[PDB]
């Protein structure tokens, strides 16, 4: 006990904390290992995802090497602050912290061969720009970028410890509106004016779930358009009936579009769902204009040719519109 | 300090995103990674057909020009990475 105490104090003694291991020698080599716990809500409005993980950095420091005391020591909160650790940081994070309750979720373990293992429990909100042009039929690519802040590749090299097995816990993710199709681990040397900095990238590919939108967006619009087509089969002299039908279908379409864009994320630029809804709106508007033409031509100014043409052309045109939309966006 | 900031902080994971570099001469280089929320008064009378001018004002808190003098290092090439800026 006291032997361990005085040996740890001696290990602290003679240690320069501002100097990395092997300052004049070859660069330090740090192996990263991530254990994902969960991916929380993913925001289209903010274009970011919140990720919780256990982040581990493994390296070798000959300064912190001891002989005897076969057990591997474990510094916890106070003397841990008196050791050099890499200045690793997440390039694209927007807000992150180490969990505090009950105690600081940090760990430092020193093996007798000078090896150091530094574990942290980190929650981080990372930026993920999204291509919301095929929304809700879109597929996204989010990334987490890990980089050294001050040291270039000549001083520190990073790598994935364990190779492709470095990152674990991907299966634990249970996002409601997204499914993780694939993930990748990449290592690069980004070149700045100062020099080549190390970089690691943990990338996920997400595919959105579509049945929600099929249930609440595409089906009601199609049903409302089919209802709007009923005017062509209603008698042409039923002015109040046909006018009420057409204008109320238009009102229902506007109601659907407005409340849909209220409940959906803001997303202040064009999507695919907007084009589909606008197509349905134009179809019902054209149906009402068709009745207006009928009323002016006949009964104003043996079914009539205008309605006979409408009955066959409107479903046919809507089918072609659906075909073009689905082929273009799928 | 940033005279127009409403909330600012220096990112602190895993360590505090700062940096100091010294050279054989007396020069010192000091880097920080900073996120700020800066006020930008908008003339939205022509919204949505509007054009806005946003600004970031950098100033000393208690030193006059007799003590400290600022300048953009590199002139028009001082600020880099504007092409990375993309908004919807």
């Amino acid at each position, epitope marked *: 006990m006291s032997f361990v105490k005085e040996t740890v104090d001696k290990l602290l003694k003679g240690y320069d904390i501002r100097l990395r291991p092997d300052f004049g020698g070859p660069p330090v080599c740090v192996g990263m290992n991530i254990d994902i716990a969960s991916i929380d809500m993913v925001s289209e409005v903010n274009m970011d995802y919140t990720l919780t993980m256990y982040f581990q950095q493994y390296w070798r420091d000959k300064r912190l090497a001891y002989s005897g005391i076969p057990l591997n020591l474990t510094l916890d909160n106070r003397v841990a602050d008196q050791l050099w650790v890499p200045d690793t940081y997440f390039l*694209n994070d927007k807000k992150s912290f180490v969990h505090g309750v009950t105690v600081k979720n940090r760990m430092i373990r020193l093996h007798p061969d000078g090896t150091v293992l530094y574990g942290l429990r980190i929650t981080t909100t990372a930026a993920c720009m999204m291509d919301l042009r095929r929304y809700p039929l879109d597929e996204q690519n989010c990334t987490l970028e890990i980089e050294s802040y001050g040291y270039t590749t000549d001083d520190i090299e990073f790598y994935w410890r364990g190779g492709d097995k470095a990152v674990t816990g991907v299966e634990r993710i249970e996002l409601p509106q997204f499914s993780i199709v694939e993930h990748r681990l990449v290592s690069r*040397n980004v070149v700045f004016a100062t020099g*080549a900095y190390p970089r690691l990238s943990l990338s996920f590919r997400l595919k959105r779930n579509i049945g929600y939108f099929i249930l609440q967006t595409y089906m009601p619009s199609i049903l409302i358009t089919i209802l709007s087509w009923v005017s062509f089969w209603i008698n042409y002299d039923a002015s109040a009936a046909r006018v009420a039908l057409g204008i109320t279908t238009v009102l229902t379409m506007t109601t659907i579009n407005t409340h849909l864009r209220e409940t959906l994320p803001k997303i202040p630029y064009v999507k695919a769902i907007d084009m589909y809804l606008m197509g349905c709106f134009v179809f019902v508007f054209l149906a009402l204009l068709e009745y207006a033409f009928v009323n002016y031509i006949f009964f104003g100014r043996d079914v009539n040719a205008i309605d006979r043409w409408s009955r066959i052309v409107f479903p046919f045109t809507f089918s072609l519109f659906n075909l073009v939309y689905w082929l273009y966006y799928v | 300090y940033f005279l127009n900031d409403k909330k600012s902080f220096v990112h602190g994971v895993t360590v505090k995103n700062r940096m100091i570099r010294l050279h054989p001469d007396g020069t010192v280089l000091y880097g920080l990674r900073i996120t700020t929320t800066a006020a930008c008064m908008m003339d939205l009378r022509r919204y949505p057909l509007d054009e806005q001018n946003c600004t970031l004002e950098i100033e000393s808190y208690g030193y006059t020009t007799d003590d400290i003098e600022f300048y953009w290092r590199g002139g028009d090439k001082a600020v880099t990475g*504007v*092409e990375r800026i993309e908004l919807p």
Partner: nanobody
Amino acid sequence: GSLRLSCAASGHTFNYPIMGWFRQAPGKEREFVGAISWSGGSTSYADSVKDRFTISRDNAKNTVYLEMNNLKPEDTAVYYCAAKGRYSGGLYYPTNYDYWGQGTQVTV
């Protein structure tokens, strides 16, 4: 007079937003000339070709136009267009660019 060079991109263009132009004259190293962002504008140019070349993009068919003007005899080289990710680093360094095109020759 005025030479227009069009670089057409096909594939996952969103993951590689920035496009840059490089020139390699025979026996000389590859050198950056200019760069264009994703949403158009924010054009950057090298000092040697400032106020002479003007890059632009319409994204009608995912095409980037160099629109090379005020052509000088020193401005002869193999011109390449390259793609750069959202987090790759500086614009002026060829190593930061992932994919390079075939390259087009201009000799005048």
